[PDB]
Amino acid sequence: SGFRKMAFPSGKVEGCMVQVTCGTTTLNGLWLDDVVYCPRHVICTSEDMLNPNYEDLLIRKSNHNFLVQAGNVQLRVIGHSMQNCVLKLKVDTANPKTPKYKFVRIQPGQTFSVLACYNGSPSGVYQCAMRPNFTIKGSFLNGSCGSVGFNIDYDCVSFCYMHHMELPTGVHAGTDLEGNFYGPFVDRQTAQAAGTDTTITVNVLAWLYAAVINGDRWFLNRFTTTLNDFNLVAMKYNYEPLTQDHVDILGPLSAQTGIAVLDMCASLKELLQNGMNGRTILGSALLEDEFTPFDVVRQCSGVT
Amino acid sequence: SGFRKMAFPSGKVEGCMVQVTCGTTTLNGLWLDDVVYCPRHVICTSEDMLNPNYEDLLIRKSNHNFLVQAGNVQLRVIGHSMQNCVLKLKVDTANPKTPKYKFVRIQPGQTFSVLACYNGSPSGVYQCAMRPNFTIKGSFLNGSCGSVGFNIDYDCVSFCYMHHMELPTGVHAGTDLEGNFYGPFVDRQTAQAAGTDTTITVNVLAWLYAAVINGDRWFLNRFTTTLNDFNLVAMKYNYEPLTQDHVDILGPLSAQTGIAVLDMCASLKELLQNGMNGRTILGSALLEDEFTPFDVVRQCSGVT
Ligand SMILES: O=C(Cc1cc(Cl)cc2ccoc12)Nc1cncc2ccccc12
Numbered sequence: 001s002g003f004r005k006m007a008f009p010s011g012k013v014e015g016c017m018v019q020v021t022c023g024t025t026t027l028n029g030l031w032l033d034d035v036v037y038c039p040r041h042v043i044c045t046s047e048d049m050l051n052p053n054y055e056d057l058l059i060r061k062s063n064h065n066f067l068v069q070a071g072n073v074q075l076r077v078i079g080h081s082m083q084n085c086v087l088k089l090k091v092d093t094a095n096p097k098t099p100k101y102k103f104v105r106i107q108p109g110q111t112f113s114v115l116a117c118y119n120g121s122p123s124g125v126y127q128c129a130m131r132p133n134f135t136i137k138g139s140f141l142n143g144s145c146g147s148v149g150f151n152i153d154y155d156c157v158s159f160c161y162m163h164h165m166e167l168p169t170g171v172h173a174g175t176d177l178e179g180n181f182y183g184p185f186v187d188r189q190t191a192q193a194a195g196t197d198t199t200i201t202v203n204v205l206a207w208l209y210a211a212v213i214n215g216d217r218w219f220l221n222r223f224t225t226t227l228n229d230f231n232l233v234a235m236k237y238n239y240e241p242l243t244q245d246h247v248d249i250l251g252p253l254s255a256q257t258g259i260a261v262l263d264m265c266a267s268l269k270e271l272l273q274n275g276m277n278g279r280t281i282l283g284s285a286l287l288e289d290e291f292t293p294f295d296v297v298r299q300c301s302g303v304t
Numbered sequence: 305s306g307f308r309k310m311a312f313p314s315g316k317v318e319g320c321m322v323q324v325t326c327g328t329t330t331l332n333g334l335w336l337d338d339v340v341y342c343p344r345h346v347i348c349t350s351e352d353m354l355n356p357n358y359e360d361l362l363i364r365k366s367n368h369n370f371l372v373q374a375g376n377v378q379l380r381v382i383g384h385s386m387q388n389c390v391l392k393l394k395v396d397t398a399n400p401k402t403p404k405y406k407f408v409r410i411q412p413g414q415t416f417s418v419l420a421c422y423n424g425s426p427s428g429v430y431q432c433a434m435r436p437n438f439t440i441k442g443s444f445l446n447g448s449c450g451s452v453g454f455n456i457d458y459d460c461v462s463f464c465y466m467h468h469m470e471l472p473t474g475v476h477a478g479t480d481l482e483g484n485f486y487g488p489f490v491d492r493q494t495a496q497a498a499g500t501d502t503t504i505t506v507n508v509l510a511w512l513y514a515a516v517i518n519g520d521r522w523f524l525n526r527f528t529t530t531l532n533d534f535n536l537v538a539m540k541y542n543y544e545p546l547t548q549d550h551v552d553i554l555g556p557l558s559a560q561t562g563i564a565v566l567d568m569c570a571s572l573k574e575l576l577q578n579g580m581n582g583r584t585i586l587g588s589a590l591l592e593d594e595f596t597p598f599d600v601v602r603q604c605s606g607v608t
């Protein structure tokens with residue numbers, strides 16, 4: 001029992017973190033096989049970030065200008081290339097600690113763990129989600145760029161995020177490991193305001209199921225609803241529309257608790273309309289939306 | 305910017321997790337040097353847990369009855385001893401992955417990361433705190449026993465907790481690495497009700513400072529208070545008394561924000577009396593108490 005914002009064990013990813021320095025800028029790189037991935041803005045100065053021409057700035061750099069350090073030992077850079085917003089630095093040594101891995105591009109609503117790093121050294125691990133506005137609410141300081149987001153399935157690390165920047169609103173933006181930004185963000189110092197940060201409905205429902213499994217049942221009511229009726233309420237409260245695909249994804253949790261998905265929707269509808277009344281659910285006074293149905297089942301089943 | 309419930313990177317601890325089986329019971333062990341630490345209840349059956357006599361039950365076990373497996377390889381047990389509520393299994397091989405380590409006994413209000421494990425395999429990492437009633441609000445299932453709590457200072461892991469049991473209230477109890485339980489709990493299936501789970505005042509204040517540092521300042525008011533006046537309010541709300549030692553510990557955060565500790569106390573006093581009014585602080589609708597002043601400074605400074 002108990003339900004926590006749980007991150008994946010970070011060891012496999014710690015073994016991949018390196019320091020990348022170009023000129024006066026130092027950030028983190030991800031070393032997999034004989035390639036080090038890092039944000040392409042490592043080649044920029046502060047004056048460059050206003051309107052950088054990355055192809056032109058990159059022409060002035062050679063392999064020897066990218067200093068890659070793994071622990072206290074230097075890596076030899078034998079090639080460099082830009083793929084979208086990331087640089088791929090080919091080194092002469094394969095990372096001996098390379099885990100089995102994949103590069104995945106996640107959808108909004110999906111969760112992942114972040115290993116926050118500075119100077120190629122891990123500082124902490126936390127769980128977050130790709131928001132519906134394609135930002136992440138992380139915890140990153142200057143130097144955290146190149147820190148990565150990932151999921152683990154037994155022994156395979158699926159990297160899904162690399163940290164690039166913080167928006168003026170304190171929210172974060174980055175790319176997948178092919179260097180494509182999530183959402184409309186660009187790696188430049190410009191006006192980039194985030195869109196509506198809607199609540200991930202299917203995740204709230206999953207977390208309501210996690211609460212029932214852990215004994216918090218006060219919010220269960222005598223009502224039911226329809227997908228269309230629930231969605232009118234969800235629209236009003238800036239919640240993502242619930243689809244039949246989401247209802248299907250909630251099937252195992254519905255089966256475990258014996259609570260029909262639409263009955264849980266009616267409980268959620270009442271919580272939206274009436275509030276919490278000073279009560280809590282799983283130690284929270286707000287409806288948590290950064291646990292997917294898969295995360296709930298995993299945490300509640302002890303998958304290693 | 306951003307503030308998350310951040311755990312320490314778990315890699316150093318993952319390299320210490322092993323599986324310990326005795327009879328029909330399988331739980332986790334912590335392998336440091338040539339010793340494997342595990343809860344002594346690994347020697348019990350379900351009928352034993354009602355009123356176990358651990359010395360007597362242990363007499364029936366020999367080194368060969370403790371099956372210790374690190375990954376897929378078996379460890380040879382060459383000695384066994386009981387220290388308080390833990391067993392120390394001497395193996396013939398030093399753990400090659402033993403990090404620099406200490407065994408510490410933490411005080412209530414102190415935070416640590418937990419590496420939840422099953423069958424010697426890590427499933428996740430989360431941050432929690434030693435509650436003032438000596439319980440922890442973890443996330444543990446059957447088989448999680450022997451999972452550990454720790455802090456890291458650069459390269460030294462200070463182990464502070466080993467999971468032993470869940471109370472009927474869904475809260476958790478365990479020992480330090482010398483096998484002494486935190487609080488009054490015992491490793492037996494008996495009536496053990498937890499005391500008042502008071503709120504860790506100094507941690508709430510630290511988290512209010514973290515909110516100011518991250519731009520959430522709506523709760524800042526025009527008031528001040530005294531330690532004695534604040535403590536009358538804290539008493540009413542089941543908050544721990546604030547001492548001059550806590551005020552001193554909050555000095556760096558007070559210096560960083562320019563907000564006197566007693567002024568932050570007055571803001572906290574108003575939040576206790578008036579509530580949040582449907583507003584949030586650092587994405588929370590309740591006052592968070594599982595970040596110490598040290599955790600706030602660390603997260604806000606990027607210590608690796
Ligand atoms: O934002 C950056 C660096 C950066 C990257 C890019 Cl792609 C564009 C721009 C425009 C200005 O700075 C840019 N990095 C940081 C990441 N996360 C948190 C930060 C907290 C404080 C300071 C910097 C943080």
Ligand SMILES: O=C(Cc1cc(Cl)cc2ccoc12)Nc1cncc2ccccc12
Nearest residue numbers: 001345353444445446468469470491492493
């Ligand atoms: O509680 C135990 C095992 C155990 C240990 C001790 Cl010292 C005393 C007793 C009395 C009955 O069982 C005992 N372990 C578990 C740990 N954490 C979470 C659990 C979730 C479900 C099931 C068991 C959980």
